[PDB]
Amino acid sequence: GSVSRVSREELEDRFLRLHDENILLKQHARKQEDKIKRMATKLIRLVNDK
Amino acid sequence: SRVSREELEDRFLRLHDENILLKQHARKQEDKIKRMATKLIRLVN
């Protein structure tokens, strides 16, 4: 176990940074999903001439 | 208040495994979006 050799201070640091990275990943995925749908919706509106 | 060593190791790993799965999902979704956009470009030309 590579984690079993890490000192406590570095494991704590890594956990803190890993949590913040996970939050940013989910927020970016959420924002990406929302923009993709609007562009696809607007693509559909574009081809449906009105 | 303190976090035990086993608990800290436990949470880190589950954060790590979840982080891995999040990145793989973004990667694959990213690949599919490009090659549908890409042939949309091919479609138009």
Curated annotation (Swiss-Prot), chain A:
Reported tissue expression: Ubiquitously expressed. Not found in heart and skin.
UniProt-annotated location(s): Cytoplasm; Cytoplasm, Cytoskeleton, Cilium basal body; Cytoplasm, Cytoskeleton, Cilium axoneme; Cytoplasm, Cytoskeleton, Microtubule organizing center, Centrosome
Protein family membership: Belongs to the RPGRIP1 family.
Function: Negatively regulates signaling through the G-protein coupled thromboxane A2 receptor (TBXA2R). May be involved in mechanisms like programmed cell death, craniofacial development, patterning of the limbs, and formation of the left-right axis. Involved in the organization of apical junctions; the function is proposed to implicate a NPHP1-4-8 module. Does not seem to be strictly required for ciliogenesis. Involved in establishment of planar cell polarity such as in cochlear sensory epithelium and is proposed to implicate stabilization of disheveled proteins.
Assembly information from the UniProt record: Interacts with NPHP4 and NPHP1; NPHP1, NPHP4 and RPGRIP1L are proposed to form a functional NPHP1-4-8 module localized to cell-cell contacts and the ciliary transition zone; NPHP4 mediates the interaction between NPHP1 and RPGRIP1L. Interacts with IQCB1; the interaction likely requires additional interactors. Interacts with TBXA2R (via C-terminus), RPGR, NEK4. Interacts with NPHP4, INVS and DVL2; proposed to form a complex involved in DVL2 stabilization. Interacts with PSMD2.
Name of the molecule in the record: Protein fantom
Organism of provenance: Mus musculus (Mouse)
The organism's taxonomic lineage, starting at the top: Eukaryota, Metazoa, Chordata, Craniata, Vertebrata
Interval of the full protein contained in this chain: 42 to 89 of 1264
